């Protein structure tokens, strides 16, 4: 069912896209430190 | 929403009275802080005024 994959794939894109946001937090923190 | 607009307008109106008397005697220096303070209220008035038209 390819149509369901669209939900699955775009879910993964959001699962790790936010994690990138978390990673950015560490980098900016070191700049302040 | 309408009740808030006039209230904020009155606060500016009250400061407008002091602003009206701020320059009285030529005390322009004091009016600078009063007028500079009022704009913090005028922006809210316009924001609510525009939003009021949308709800109509």
């Amino acid at each position: 069912a390819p149509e369901d994959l669209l939900e699955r794939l775009l879910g993964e894109m959001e699962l790790e896209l936010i994690e990138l946001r978390r990673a950015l937090a560490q980098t900016i923190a070191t700049f302040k430190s | 929403t309408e009740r808030q607009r006039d209230a904020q307008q009155l606060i500016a109106q009250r400061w407008y009275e002091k602003a009206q008397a701020a320059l009285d005697r030529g005390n322009e220096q004091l009016a600078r802080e009063a007028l500079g303070q009022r704009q913090s209220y005028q922006s809210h008035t316009e924001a609510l005024g525009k939003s009021l038209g949308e709800q109509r």
């Binding site: 390819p2 794939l9 894109m13 790790e16 980098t27 070191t30 | -």
Partner: protein
């Protein structure tokens, strides 16, 4: 001499330890960004006539 000589090693070594640790997080952060933020593009730009995820 020994107490003076040995202390110098500890002082110099102690400074270096924290210096390495600072770079440890920095390289780790770059790795996380370039590995996590990278993976999305292999999900979006899949093999296709226009790299439109290959499903469209």
């Amino acid at each position: 001499a020994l107490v003076e000589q040995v202390r110098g090693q500890l002082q110099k070594l102690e400074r270096k330890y924290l210096e390495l640790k600072s770079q440890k997080n920095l390289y780790l952060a770059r790795l996380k960004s370039a590995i996590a933020a990278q993976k999305i593009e292999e999900i979006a730009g899949n093999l296709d006539n226009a790299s439109a995820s290959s499903l469209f």
